[PDB]
């Protein structure tokens with residue numbers, strides 16, 4: 177079955193006075209592949225995809241500040257905080273040019289870095305990614321009341337911080353196949369203490385929905401503007417029925433974005449890595465071999 181373990185040797189690097197954990201495997205020469213997780217996951221989400229890429233390319237998978245095995249400073253965990261820590265992480269590792277593999281909130285981080293540093297990005301593989309949601313009618317109806325609730329300091333904090341709903345409920349609702357107890361426990365591990373759940377609550381409060389927050393909407397519009405014009409090689413994974421990227425939309429996006437190939441993963445919602453890791457990892461490895469890296 178789909179693997180549940182996390183065998184990777186831990187690595188830590190000091191970034192802005194705090195430690196960030198990261199997976200680092202594969203050959204030391206060549207162009208590295210940087211994997212960026214989102215909410216409420218960690219590098220664990222890449223555990224079954226990296227084994228297809230690591231034979232031929234270095235794979236680096238950080239845990240975002242406040243998540244995974246990374247330290248937990250008392251921040252707001254705004255998107256800007258993740259930007260500062262990820263920018264510093266990339267420079268601390270001395271990375272020059274990279275290929276990005278990104279998902280969901282990791283996709284906003286990755287696209288925003290790539291737009292600012294296009295000479296250092298040799299390709300982007302992405303899935304169930306963040307674009308502006310113009311009105312609440314474009315948010316998936318089955319998750320609309322909950323995300324509206326999450327975006328409050330009363331009910332949203334009760335749900336996400338006190339009751340851990342993002343881990344116990346939203347995470348499984350983003351995977352078609354059933355998650356095992358061992359997998360759930362890996363996802364729960366960084367957040368056993370409620371107070372550490374701050375990033376899980378700030379993230380949905382940052383989503384660019386109905387114009388709000390305006391600073392995030394502007395930033396995401398900007399990287400989308402770039403992505404529709406840039407010749408950067410693109411690999412878009414999508415699933416059925418999907419969540420943010422449904423099949424008919426994925427096909428339209430791939431034909432509109434330059435130098436984009438789209439790959440059907442089969443059944444999927446948001447966390448496509450949990451529904452078909454072997455296809456995602458084997459397609460990434462094949463696509464890397466086509467790049468000038």
Ligand SMILES: CN(C)c1ccc2c(-c3cc(C(=O)NCCOCCOCCCCCCCl)ccc3C(=O)O)c3ccc(=[N+](C)C)cc-3oc2c1
Pocket residue numbers: 214279280281304305306318319322323339341344345346347348349350383419420446
């Ligand atoms: C302990 N306690 C107080 C709760 C409360 C609620 C649940 C829910 C649940 C959750 C939602 C819920 O999250 N909607 C949102 C779904 O969004 C999925 C789509 O992806 C969004 C991606 C966004 C991407 C952004 C970056 Cl691109 C709604 C209502 C309830 C409910 O049952 O009231 C559970 C639901 C499932 C579940 N299992 C399958 C084991 C367990 C649950 O255990 C709860 C415990």
Ligand SMILES: [Cl-]
Pocket residue numbers: 215379380381383
């Ligand atoms: Cl979120």
